[PDB]
Design a protein around this nucleic acid. Structure first.
Ligand code: MG
Length: 580
DNA sequence: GCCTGACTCTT
DNA sequence: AGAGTCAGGCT
């Protein structure tokens, strides 16, 4: 049952064909500066396993890796590329990435190893990585014969599966999406991760000192007001103090017991002085543990940088996610929190952070796809979209829009951009399900084109089995036909939301590719550091700011041509915080 | 150790 | 929705 291969102790020319499946195995979850445990090559001449100390010290092998005209098929090529970048080796000529191919074919499969991709085409001659490496504490690299066979089987699966994946992509009109968008983006992301983002650890540490002291003050005040010490961070213990000792009313239960969420506690504040102090404690503790301690833990002491990993094959919308650290949820809303962004600084002296963000990209996409005359007109006039929505829903003039009217309109706009239920909108606005339904109804009378689009997109999802984005990304929605109402409704909302959010993701990904090309053409030293859904963050010499002010917004604005303009705001400063 | 549930940040 | 932290109950 053992697949034939050559366990090479030296590199030979027949290993360096100009078309090959390549496995460069990094087993550590976080691949930054991580070991490469083994290498496998499959090509028309046979199957080969190479030890990394052998292969990666071979000038011919390394040149082969770096020759763009020697084509390679891989799985998760960014992992390999980055691990190699840390060893000073460049990987080029990756013409097919099976991870990204499987992701585009069906993002809900959750394909995370070669075995899971292979299964989609009834190929099972490869083991899941979890079966070979083990799980958790038991995770280990096996002995060489077991390792070697695994890597060769992965490589053989890649070799076999390229053709059928490419054929289905083509049938779906997704072949360009793979080859011209996701794969090129993967190289750009690899560069971004490798560059990293410099952190002023001293400033974070001082902030942590300050928080630590404010926490101790509040924590003591909590115990005074409770008349005893307890674990504030245990919703169980807190529940007993609040709802039993202090007899506060129970406005919401959870599966386990009593809810202690911020929104419940906010309704309880008038009853007892402990509640505000709990909320304050939760806010500070969140900052301290998730953003000060959580960032400090993942700063590389060697670089003084954080090197995130972007997961390009996770979301069902096509958005990127970010880990270790997650840089897509750094506080912005509250000033105390926002100050965390002061710790993200340029990696060189006399460089600055430059940030550019799309203004209402999701609603502008909606205008374009729905062709709603009112929404299209609003963006053609570059109106404040929330004020304009308030004017229409409440049928008032601009100077009759009150702050609460605007807040409520904005909540409706948010519910559209994120596909939330009427229940969700109700929770968000602290109103009844019924009143939420009336708001939504008023919206559709002002934007009948959006209503029509919603109805049409759901019918299309029902007919075809899936919805698509501008750039041909697909999401299958088998629950759209369910008889469970909550199940069906969620799927209908995903039918509505996905073309919106997915198309925005498509646009920014194209912008990133276009921007990388232009930065090179223009000979700038500016580099992309991060993407945060609708914004791009770069660092550059201070001497490049004026050029980037013109360059970056134009590249982002012209990424696609919609029925409405795209608009990009930008800022720069000495820290990410100041780039506001 | 491993797993789940509660909670919270941004988008 | 996605990532992360903490507790608490599992083995
Ligand atoms: Mg924005």
């Amino acid at each position: 049952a053992k697949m034939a291969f050559t366990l090479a102790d030296r590199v030979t020319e027949e290993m360096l064909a100009d078309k090959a499946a390549l496995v460069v195995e990094v087993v550590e979850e976080n691949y930054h500066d991580a070991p490469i445990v083994g290498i496998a090559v499959v090509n028309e001449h046979g199957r080969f396993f190479l030890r990394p100390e052998t292969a990666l010290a071979d000038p011919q092998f390394v040149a082969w890796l770096g020759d763009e005209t020697k084509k390679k098929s891989m799985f998760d090529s960014k992992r390999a590329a980055v691990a190699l970048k840390w060893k000073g080796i460049e990987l080029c000529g990756v013409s097919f990435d099976l991870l990204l191919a499987a992701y585009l074919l069906d993002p809900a499969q959750g394909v995370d190893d070669v075995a899971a991709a292979a299964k989609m085409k009834q190929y099972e001659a490869v083991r899941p990585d979890e079966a070979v490496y083990g799980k958790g504490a038991k995770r280990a690299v096996p002995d060489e014969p077991v390792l070697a066979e695994h890597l060769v089987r992965k490589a053989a699966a890649i070799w076999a599966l390229e053709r059928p994946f490419l054929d289905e992509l083509r049938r779906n009109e997704q072949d360009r999406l793979l080859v011209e968008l996701e794969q090129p983006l993967s190289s750009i992301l690899a560069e971004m991760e490798f560059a990293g983002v410099k952190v002023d650890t001293k400033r974070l540490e001082q902030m942590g000192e300050e928080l630590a002291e404010q926490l101790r003050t509040v924590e003591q005040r909590i115990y005074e007001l409770a008349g005893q010490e307890f674990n504030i961070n245990s919703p169980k213990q807190l529940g007993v103090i609040l709802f039993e000792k202090l007899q506060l009313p129970v406005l919401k239960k959870s599966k386990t017991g009593y809810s202690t969420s911020a929104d419940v506690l906010e309704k309880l504040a008038p009853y007892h002085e402990i509640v505000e102090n709990i909320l304050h404690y939760r806010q500070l503790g969140k900052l301290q543990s998730t953003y000060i301690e959580g960032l400090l833990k993942v700063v590389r002491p060697d670089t003084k940088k954080v090197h995130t990993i972007f997961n390009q094959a996770l979301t069902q919308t096509g958005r990127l996610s970010s880990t270790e650290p997650n840089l897509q949820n750094i506080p912005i809303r509250l000033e105390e929190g926002r100050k965390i962004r002061q710790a993200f600084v340029p990696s060189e002296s006399d460089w600055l952070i430059f940030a550019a963000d799309y203004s209402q990209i999701e609603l502008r996409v909606l205008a374009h796809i729905a062709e709603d005359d009112n929404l299209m007109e609003a963006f053609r006039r570059d109106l404040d979209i929330h004020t304009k929505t308030a004017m229409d829903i409440f049928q008032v003039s601009e100077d009759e829009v009150t702050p609460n009217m605007r807040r409520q309109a904005k909540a409706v706009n948010f519910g559209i951009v994120y596909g939330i239920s009427d229940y969700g909108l109700a929770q968000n606005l602290n109103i009844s399900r019924k009143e939420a339904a009336e708001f939504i109804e008023r919206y559709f009378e002002s934007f009948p084109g959006v209503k029509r689009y919603m109805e049409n997109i759901v019918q299309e999802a029902k007919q075809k089995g899936y919805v698509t984005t501008l750039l041909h990304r697909r999401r299958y929605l088998p629950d759209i036909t369910s008889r469970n109402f909550n199940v069906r409704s969620f799927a209908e909302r995903m039918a509505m939301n996905t073309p919106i959010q997915g198309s925005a993701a498509d646009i920014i990904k194209k912008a990133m590719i276009d921007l990388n090309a232009r930065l090179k053409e223009e000979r700038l030293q500016a580099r992309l550091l991060l993407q945060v859904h609708d914004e791009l963050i770069l660092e550059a010499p201070k001497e490049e700011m004026e050029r980037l002010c013109r360059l970056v917004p134009e590249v982002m604005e012209q990424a696609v041509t919609l029925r409405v303009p795209l608009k990009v705001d930008y800022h720069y400063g000495s820290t990410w915080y100041d780039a506001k």
